[PDB]
Design a binder for this molecule. Structure first.
Ligand SMILES: *[C@@H]1O[C@H](CO)[C@@H](O)[C@H](O)[C@H]1NC(C)=O
Lengths: 195, 181
């Protein structure tokens, strides 16, 4: 697994860099970014084929680097060298990572059956992030009254999400949270019955 | 840019601590980084460490070039220092909260610049030094940063938590409060 060389040009100063590989279908698009603090200075974009000065402070490098055939050919060769190579490895491993969602259902408050409450479907510790969470009342999907936080990244290669339903439970009402995910052969369902 | 997946080497060097960082992310999750003191590659999961390798020297060489670029840009910009962008802070559990059941508190600190922070966990007003962990300073596409702090704990009806965050963009230290329910 490989990388490529960046080109060379109280108080705090910072310099940042990005080497980005965008995989789409079977193609690779490569971006190289040079950044002073939060300001992008010079960019290489494989779709352009050469360096572009984003700011005036990046103009000398952009112009000089573009006059070096060898520097350009090294960068133009990146999509088919570094990007493809690292991607094939991530396809074989990272993209095979499957972690099953745990599903928990609980009312936001416990108590009577007179008035509104929130029924919370808490779905945790799954990967990858693409997921479908549905609420059912007595066998019928609920579209209204569904309040979701969106996908929450835990930062440890797992996601969670909370999808809650505005409800007014009557005795003998059946609520189901249905979860579908690529790691699951069949959907996970958790049932909560009003009592 | 249209893509199924985004694979990114992100790196920075700065004058204040931490002075350098080199990492690779896949779809916005950090897969590995180079420990610049130990001069070795550190994998986020054992899954990756067993299947993949990376020559840490590749990262070390790019850091050195980045440092030269910093030196050059401090002068060319007439010592231009960026504005301090304060962080948003959120606290949330990893697992559904059950009294007596081991869980992990997550403090997420987002959208800040520069990557210079002080973070402290507080339990009932007192600092916690055991069972704590943290992510690297993670890059954002807007060139600001985010970061995760972690605390393992056992939820109880008695205990109260705060995530205490210091950053130059804040007028005063920020506390985000959390309780088990
Ligand atoms: C971290 O703590 C020390 C001591 O309080 C302080 O000097 C430093 O500026 C703090 N850093 C930030 C980002 O607030």
């Amino acid at each position: 697994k490989v990388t490529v060389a960046f080109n060379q040009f109280p108080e705090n100063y910072l310099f940042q860099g990005r080497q980005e590989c965008y995989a789409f279908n079977g193609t690779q698009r490569f971006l190289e970014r040079y950044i002073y603090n939060r300001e992008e200075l010079v960019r290489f974009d494989s779709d352009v084929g050469e360096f572009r000065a984003v700011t005036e402070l990046g103009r000398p490098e952009a112009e000089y680097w573009n006059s070096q055939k060898d520097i350009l050919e090294e960068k133009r060769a990146v999509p088919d060298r570094m990007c493809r190579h690292n991607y094939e490895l991530d396809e074989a491993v990272t993209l095979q990572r499957r972690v099953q969602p745990k599903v928990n259902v609980s009312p936001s408050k416990k108590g009577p059956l007179q008035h509104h409450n929130l029924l919370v479907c808490h779905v945790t510790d799954f990967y990858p992030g693409s997921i479908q969470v549905r609420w059912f009342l007595n066998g019928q999907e609920e579209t209204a009254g569904v309040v979701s936080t969106n996908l929450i990244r835990n930062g440890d290669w797992t996601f969670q999400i909370l999808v809650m339903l505005e409800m007014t439970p009557q005795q003998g009402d059946v609520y189901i949270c249905q979860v579908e995910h690529t790691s699951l052969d069949s959907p996970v369902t958790v049932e909560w019955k009003a009592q | 840019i249209k893509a199924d997946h985004v694979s990114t080497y992100a790196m920075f060097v700065q004058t204040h601590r931490p002075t350098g960082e080199f990492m690779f992310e896949f779809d916005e999750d950090e897969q590995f980084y180079v420990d610049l003191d130990k001069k070795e590659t550190v994998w986020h999961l054992e899954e990756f460490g067993r299947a993949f390798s990376f020559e840490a020297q590749g990262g070390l060489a790019n850091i050195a070039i980045l440092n030269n670029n910093l030196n050059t840009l401090i002068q060319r910009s007439n010592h231009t220092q960026a504005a301090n962008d304060p962080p948003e802070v959120t606290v949330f559990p990893k697992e559904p909260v059950e009294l007596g059941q081991p869980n992990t508190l997550i403090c997420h600190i987002d959208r800040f610049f520069p990557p210079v922070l002080n973070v402290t966990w507080l339990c009932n007003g007192e600092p916690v030094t055991e069972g704590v962990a943290e992510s690297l300073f993670l890059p954002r596409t807007d060139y600001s940063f985010h970061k995760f702090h972690y605390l393992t704990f056992v939820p109880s009806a008695e205990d109260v938590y705060d995530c205490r965050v210091e950053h130059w963009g804040l007028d005063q230290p920020l506390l985000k409060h959390w309780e088990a329910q």
